[model samples]
Target: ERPEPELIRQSWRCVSRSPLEHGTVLFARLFALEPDLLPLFQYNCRQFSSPEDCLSSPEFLDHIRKVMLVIDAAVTNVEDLSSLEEYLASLGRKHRAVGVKLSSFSTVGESLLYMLEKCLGPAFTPATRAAWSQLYGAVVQAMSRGW
Candidate 1:
């Protein structure tokens, strides 16, 4: 089955209005769920002292933007996810080089759902959540190929 494009696109459009703010919600949830991941974001080769400290960094903010951008791209190509095959494959390699584990991505999925729940509130219904979860699964499925 498909990801229900209209459902995915509508909430996505709403969240996209304030990309950084929503992305921040995602990262905050991520850190709360998996504090160990905090150390992977080494800006200028400097490990962050705390979650708040890393959240404040401009460089880290750029990384958050990059994350959001990739999600947006995936949403756009939902009709045919293979369009981003090479992109996600390369991103998987980049992610590993930066110390992110493929297994850790499971937490990232939880964080994304948490962010959508926080950002979309009641608008993120069961149907929408299913749509996103399935699509995210597809994205990660392709990203794994680069490993």
Candidate 2:
């Protein structure tokens, strides 16, 4: 269960404004934390030399934009995760086909939280973190079942 639903909703309003920027930063941090995961993004790295280069690639942009949309939907449905269950399960199936493991989802959550903290600064209060954590946990759990 999530605490401070209102706080999470309010904080999401700020983060959603720059989804691409945050997404790029999120992947950057994730890569820094797990360089071995870079190969998983080869589709977006066709002509990329550095990780930062991929951030500007059309492939990367499109992929991140899609991810941002999903995150937006998740945030909008945070109050009632059952509404997102089917979508998340489908997403998990797709992710599993691409070799994504449940542990990877946990890392993704960690990276997302880190990006949120960095981007939100003082806005990322403990309540806000808890809200995000709960949401991520619920999604991950649902996804795991699909996996």
Candidate 3:
């Protein structure tokens, strides 16, 4: 069953805010699992003047905050999946630079589930867990089932 959007968003934020390393872990695992989609990391990961500076930079925060907003909008407006799907297809073109395949999406999904559970700990209640599952399914379905 699906969880409430508010609950899902809250849970997502909780998991996201715990530690930036978890975010790095999520992206690294995604790239490793789907080497084809590695180029997406070009957009997803950022480097700073120094590792310490990366964590405290307004630019980093703004980038990730936009990411959260995108995911939130994707979930909130699932009825208009085509809009999000098209957006991801544009992302896929970027992935094309590194030979991303439809199958690569599965790896990203797996990374998301594993990282969320590992980082969020008990905050990942069964309900919220279900929400992530559903959300990832939609995301992968959007990006994978078609071009």
Q: After superposition, how far is residue 57 of candidate 2 from its true place, in Å?
A: 2.7
lDDT of each: 0.85, 0.79, 0.63
Q: Which residue pairs show collisions in model 3?
A: none
Please give the RMSD to the true structure for each candidate, in Å: 2.0, 2.2, 5.2
Locate the minimum summed-lDDT window of 10 residues in model 3. Answer: 36-45
- The positional error of residue 66 in candidate 2, measured at the CA in angstroms, is 1.8
Q: What does the lDDT read for residue 76 in candidate 1?
A: 91
Best by lDDT: 1
Top-TM-score structure, candidate number: 1
Clash totals for all candidate models: 0, 0, 0
Compose the digit string of candidate 3's lDDT tens values, residues 50-137.
Answer: 5446545666566455544556666666445667878776666655565556776677678777777777788888887777788777
In lDDT terms, how accurate is model 3?
Answer: 0.63
lDDT of 2 at 21: 83
Off by over 4 Å in 2: 43-55
Q: Give the 10-residue window scoring lowest on summed lDDT in candidate 2.
A: 43-52
Residue 106, model 1: lDDT of 85
Provide TM-scores for the models.
0.91, 0.87, 0.61
Please list the residue runs of candidate 3 whose C-alpha ends up more than 4 Å from where it truly belongs after superposition: 1-3, 18-20, 31-83
Candidate 2: clashing residue pairs, number: 0
